[PDB]
Design a protein around this ligand. Structure first.
Ligand code: M07
Ligand code: M07
Lengths: 810, 810
């Protein structure tokens, strides 16, 4: 159909049809008479998978022959989403498969909807890892993603009576055609035990053993025939485990629980033993695999020349003392040499400055679970503090501030401090965030080792986040500037010469309208909800958190509603306000915010006076697959975190690429997005970081805003009195109390500027031509935010490797 | 190579080679450079599996079109063993695959050794189910085996310091290429809850739900293109199960534990809740599947015309009240009609008379777990006892004897009584056993309903137990009488005309010697144990149990040892005495017997005076795959249970088919084996059932035998004094005490006759020609013991269906 989706050659289509039929028969053991849509999906998935295998085998043998430096990306989260369409896109098979299935009497888009998301992440951090894997393969890097194969990913969200309910994400129920179990490469992981000091060093003895079984998933690069590997570990009990008899076999579950479930927390540290076990499990299995591959290329001097380990936040921080453990205790290297190797091998990316998100593990937990690692951490700390003391003599408070060990009620290990000490590079994820690191939380460390600190602004893959989810936009762009931009997003700048082109203005607006129509149809079909496709689609999709200020959005919605009720016969630009996202199950306030959103919708959506002028919808079960649907449909992207709290954001970049305008604070990557597009083409409002600092020094008094803003007072009185909960008048008392007395994120302080800015949004939307011209200026300057740019920077500035766009032989 | 293994055609070999290479590449994602023997096994398994699928699909569609009466074989145990060679044998692919792999530079027999046994059974009962499935497919019956997919089968046995150690049988670790998951046919199973009586009947409410997910395994018939199904259920938690959050997901294990592990008891009832859950789980899921298939052919009058349910012992006895529950509570049939349908549908096979093996479930367990079923059982009991009372007026003791409910300390339900009441046919598994049922334990029931009671003597499949495990013997037979005997074992009678044939005598003895050489080589390679292949191979392999009297064998071994020590320079026929079998983990005496056997070996095998004249070896980890190796190698089969205790035995039949002579009591099928071969061709000794009865009336006094048999006294004194355990003098005190004071199985009473009979065995072995002629007379008369004969009898006399040897189109 469309050019960017590749060729549908007679030979290819014929071969795909026969292999589809072969898999339906031999693999699925079905015939066309009893086969269901799900059977057809699997037949297609197996057919497409077959095209990966040759490339996968030859890529890995190529790395063995060439022996390049290997990049190991360690993460507790990989938010992959669906794999079928992505694989077709990267292999240039989309049009061919569309044709082949059409000739078989099937609709490929219907088949695509059957696949479960691989939801092995919470949101931004896990999705970043996924985009990074795509870019590393596209740039021809010898890269491996290492994580945990959770049996249960992020929970499925159901809304019942306006409240969030959780159910298990049983994503493996029907099988996973993309993974290949590798039980032959199973490795032991040790827990508990005790440390024994001998004539020849320390020994870790009397341990409990859990097996780590790897599953490999292919990661295809964009049309370069490179296929890299994501290796995820699954926990298995040894066969002699606890070996009355029946109970001993049943108790195997205790060991295997390590890989059972993803902790569902976004930007929050939960210091539970099971989580610590997960963190060591991935680190210990991965490091053994790395060392084995290195030895099968004695001389650990060349280790950092052949190995780079990237730590995705502090979650895999145990890699540092584990590497030291192996080099010192097992390989018999002297401490100083082992440390040199460790520092040159490891690098650390920080993803957040929120205090409650930082990992600080109780010493007593590490003492019991990992006694040798605690000893190594103590030794690292002593040698590090000796360096600090030499550099800043007599500065006793600096010593206590910089220590890896924190004293108090319970002694804790600060994992961020451990990571900085044991890495040759430390980076933040957006310019403003990286600067905040050097000025505030890591100031002492920056003063000691300034060369260590870097910035690497986040990005998103334009394969998934443009070509896959928005083929209509990809096509109209390709018509003007060709296809090269898909792996070189900076080429989008060429679209600036089309901002006054009448045909292009028309096509951009047409594609958006089509996306909005399709999404409005999706909502009626799957959720029986009705929306006006002619309204402004105002979208805030992201995890529910106080810092992200879904509450500020709520205040604006109620403001709009109240203004309509005050002057019903006055014209207003119609809006569909859509808010979606999951709350962590134990996060009370986040669950209350969801209830508030649905409660507002219950009032607003059924008021006859409002009509089709304002609709409030909560998007249930926000996940990667839903993002791919709603983002291309959006007109307005809400990026409204309190300045200094969103380290980068990546949803922001997705919206910019897909033709939505942004209303946002100068926070995270928003700053750089506005810099790229020009501030005139961005809807910027609210406090800057400096303004937040000034307010904190003064003391934030929410009452002041309540007293001086009549429209805000009305809303608070409505919430308190039970306007949005008539049967339960005091339902939202917790929300009001927080807003009035203990709001860490200063919702009221940005209210006036936000509402004012929203009026400017509505004004521009009244002028379709000028709206679209501003959209074109955003799309055209979105190039910097490709994860290809991000990964190229990591490669050159941290890993010491050169990216390549050269094809491998097919 | 050999004729019975089929053709190796140029086309077939070429196609097998290319499909092998295709699977290694696409399915396993390997190349010849990194592939291991295990990879090669899987490539072969997938290649052979492909040949099943067409036949499997067409067989099942054929049954849908023809709508024959369906046979449902319900069992908690299916002891399948390995599948690769069996599939090749039944598809006539063995020689072709041997050639194809040879041309690829691989040894197929090496590849076959990689496959794990499917050990979903304890021994005889589970193996009978497996042979039955093979015969039902070979006889073209529309038959389905239904059971549980245990994650862990019968434990692997390790011998450490002469003691049995258990480890988990993680048989699914590397995957199972033979099964096809069918998550789309998942069914709910209900537990606990309460009964609510309404206007329109009873309702079972507030239940806990566990999902039953089916896995299908193909069961190929012998060269008839029929492929039947074994459907095994796996337990899955519903996604809202227990839905803080993390613990709720972890607690899913509680539901899924139902299908985790096989109870490892042979002929013993363990009344645990988990076992009851397993029994209902298989019954509830299976019955829903049966009813669905019946409705997709309202009128339940024709149900028994289209459905037969065979209960493999009382383990699936809950099928009776479950069927009543569905028909009465859900389908709204009147009780009398539902009962008529149930009785005509169900039939019950009893497999044991040992009191400790009979299922008697505490009422309090059924009350809590299955409250509606208990109510139905009470109603069945009342109506049944009303029938008994009408037939035998005033016989109050008969009423209490026949009741399904047993009174006492704890009230129990007698499941055997339930089965007899609710089945139209009840059978024992050998003539002597079926007679014992009518004369003793079920006498009252036989008097009420004589027409119900039948015999169906057990059998074994000649495919696995001759062609597969002993191709050399199969070939020399085929050379004389052709190939038809493989599916018509009665044709072996034609070998009687060759008993004086000098060439045949030579060939039979040659095949045995070759088997003995191969097995002696297997022992050195895998266990570093050395044996004389010129010695008489004296073998007792079966589960360890007091009733099977491994202890009687031990007494003979020590007798032989003592006689050698008394007269060292006197010639004796050299023997290798081999004993193998697993003990149930909680069966103390059985574990003590294993230790005794190894302790005897420790003394006997290292005595320089004995030399190579006597060796005692314990065969570790006895299982189906080991049976296939040792049985063809055996000279003497030990079948020495106390008369009246072994219901049938099936190991006995395996040895007879493979050219071993039998030393045995007149117990189980031994009686019929001797009848078929002639008593002159069997080594019969010991008490008959009548003699055991006489001794019981008198009172068994072991001291009497001790006092009057000097050779027996010597052995007991050796055991007691610590001759076989010098470092632990009193190690075998429990064994001596049991033998002397509480031996239920009268070991001493058969000692003299046993030793005498063993002397006659040695005498005949000294004459190779006459030994072999007697062997030929055994093989020639083994035809009755084919499971094809057994299944044909079930078909005609119980199920009301006609077997067919007609081919389906290929
Ligand atoms: C479980 O602990 C955490 C889970 C998630 C996270 C984060 N999720 O999103 C964050 C940080 O990382 C993204 C990728 O760099 C950034 O774009 C977000 O701004 C940041 O909040 C931090 C800790
Ligand atoms: C767990 O409960 C039981 C397990 C096994 C058994 C049996 N195993 O072997 C038995 C009975 O059945 C075989 C098949 O009919 C017979 O050949 C054996 O003689 C009998 O002991 C009985 C109860």
């Amino acid at each position: 159909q469309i050019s960017v989706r590749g060729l549908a050659g007679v030979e290819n289509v014929t071969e795909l049809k026969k292999n589809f039929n072969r898999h339906l028969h031999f693999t699925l053991v079905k015939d066309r008479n009893v086969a269901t849509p799900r059977d057809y999906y699997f037949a297609l998935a197996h057919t497409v998978r077959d095209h990966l295998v040759g490339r996968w085998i030859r890529t890995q043998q190529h790395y063995y022959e060439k022996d390049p430096k290997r990049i190991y990306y360690l993460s507790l989260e990989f938010y992959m989403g669906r794999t079928l369409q992505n694989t077709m896109v990267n292999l240039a098979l989309e049009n061919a498969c569309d044709e082949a299935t059409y000739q078989l009497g099937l609709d490929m888009e219907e088949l695509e909807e059957i696949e479960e998301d691989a939801g092995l992440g919470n949101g931004g951090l896990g999705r970043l890892a996924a985009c990074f894997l795509d870019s590393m393969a596209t740039l021809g890097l010898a890269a491996y993603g290492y994580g945990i194969r959770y049996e249960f990913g992020i929970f499925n969200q159901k809304i019942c009576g306006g409240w969030q309910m959780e159910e298990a994400d049983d994503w493996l129920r029907y099988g996973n055609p993309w993974e290949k179990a590798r039980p032959e490469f199973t490795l032991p992981v040790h827990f508990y035990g005790r440390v024994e000091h001998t004539s020849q060093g320390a020994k870790w003895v009397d341990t409990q053993v859990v097996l780590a079984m790897p599953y490999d998933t292919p990661v295809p690069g964009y049309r370069n025939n490179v296929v890299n590997t994501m290796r995820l570990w699954s926990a298995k009990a040894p066969n002699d485990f606890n070996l009355g008899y029946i109970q001993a076999v049943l108790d195997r579950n205790l060991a295997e629980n390590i890989s059972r479930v993803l902790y569902p927390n976004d930007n929050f540290f939960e210091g539970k033993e099971l989580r610590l076990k997960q963190e060591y499990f991935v680190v210990a299995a991965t490091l053994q695999d790395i060392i084995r591959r290195f030895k099968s290329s004695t001389n650990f001097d060349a280790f950092p020349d052949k190995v780079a380990i990237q730590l995705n936040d502090t979650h895999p921080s145990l890699a540092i003392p584990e590497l030291m453990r192996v080099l010192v205790d097992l390989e018999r290297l002297d401490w100083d040499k082992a440390w040199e190797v460790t520092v040159k091998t490891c690098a650390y990316t920080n993803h957040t400055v929120l205090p409650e998100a930082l990992e600080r593990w109780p010493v007593h937990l590490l003492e019991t679970l990992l006694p040798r690692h605690l000893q190594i951490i103590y030794e690292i700390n002593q040698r590090f503090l000796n360096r600090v003391a030499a550099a800043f003599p007599g500065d006793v408070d600096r010593l206590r501030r910089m220590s890896l060990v924190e004293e108090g009620a319970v002694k804790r290990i600060n994992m961020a401090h451990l990571c900085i000490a044991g890495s040759h590079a430390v980076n933040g994820v957006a310019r403003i965030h990286s600067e905040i690191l050097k000025k505030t939380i890591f100031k002492d460390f920056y003063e000691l080792e300034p060369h260590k600190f870097q910035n690497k602004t986040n990005g998103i893959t334009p394969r998934r986040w443009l070509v896959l989810c928005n083929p209509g936009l990809a096509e109209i762009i390709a018509e003007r500037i060709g296809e090269e931009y898909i792996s070189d997003l900076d080429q989008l700048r060429k679209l600036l010469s089309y901002v006054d082109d009448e045909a292009f203005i028309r096509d951009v607006a047409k594609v958006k309208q089509e996306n909005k129509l399709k999404f409005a149809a999706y909502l009626e079909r799957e959720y029986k909800v009705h929306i006006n496709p002619n309204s402004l689609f105002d979208v805030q999709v992201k995890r529910i958190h106080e810092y992200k200020r879904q509450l500020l959005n709520c205040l604006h919605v109620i403001t709009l509603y109240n203004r309509i009720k005050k002057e019903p016969n006055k014209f207003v630009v119609p809006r569909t306000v859509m808010i979606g996202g999951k709350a962590a199950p134990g996060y009370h306030m986040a669950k209350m915010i969801i209830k508030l959103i649905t409660a507002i919708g219950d009032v607003v959506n059924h008021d006859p006076v409002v009509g089709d002028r304002l609709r409030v919808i909560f998007l249930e079960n926000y996940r990667v697959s839903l993002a791919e649907k709603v983002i291309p449909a959006a007109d307005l992207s809400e990026q409204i975190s309190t300045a200094g709290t969103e380290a980068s954001g990546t949803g922001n970049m997705k919206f910019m690429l897909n033709g939505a305008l942004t209303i946002g604070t100068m926070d995270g990557a928003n700053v750089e997005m506005a810099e790229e597009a020009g501030e005139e083409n961005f809807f910027i409002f609210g406090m800057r970081v400096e303004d937040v600092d000034r307010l904190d020094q003064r003391g934030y008094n929410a009452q002041e805003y309540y007293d001086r803003i009549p429209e805000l007072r009305q809303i608070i009185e409505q919430l308190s009195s039970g306007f949005f909960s008539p049967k339960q008048p005091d339902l939202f008392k917790d929300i009001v109390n927080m807003l009035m007395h203990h709001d860490r994120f200063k919702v009221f302080a940005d209210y006036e500027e936000y509402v004012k800015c929203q009026e400017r949004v509505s004004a521009l939307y009244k002028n379709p031509r000028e709206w679209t011209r501003m959209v074109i200026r955003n799309i055209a300057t979105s190039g910097k935010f490709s994860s290809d740019r991000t990964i190229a920077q990591y490669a050159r500035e941290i890993w010491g490797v050169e990216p390549s766009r050269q094809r491998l032989p097919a």
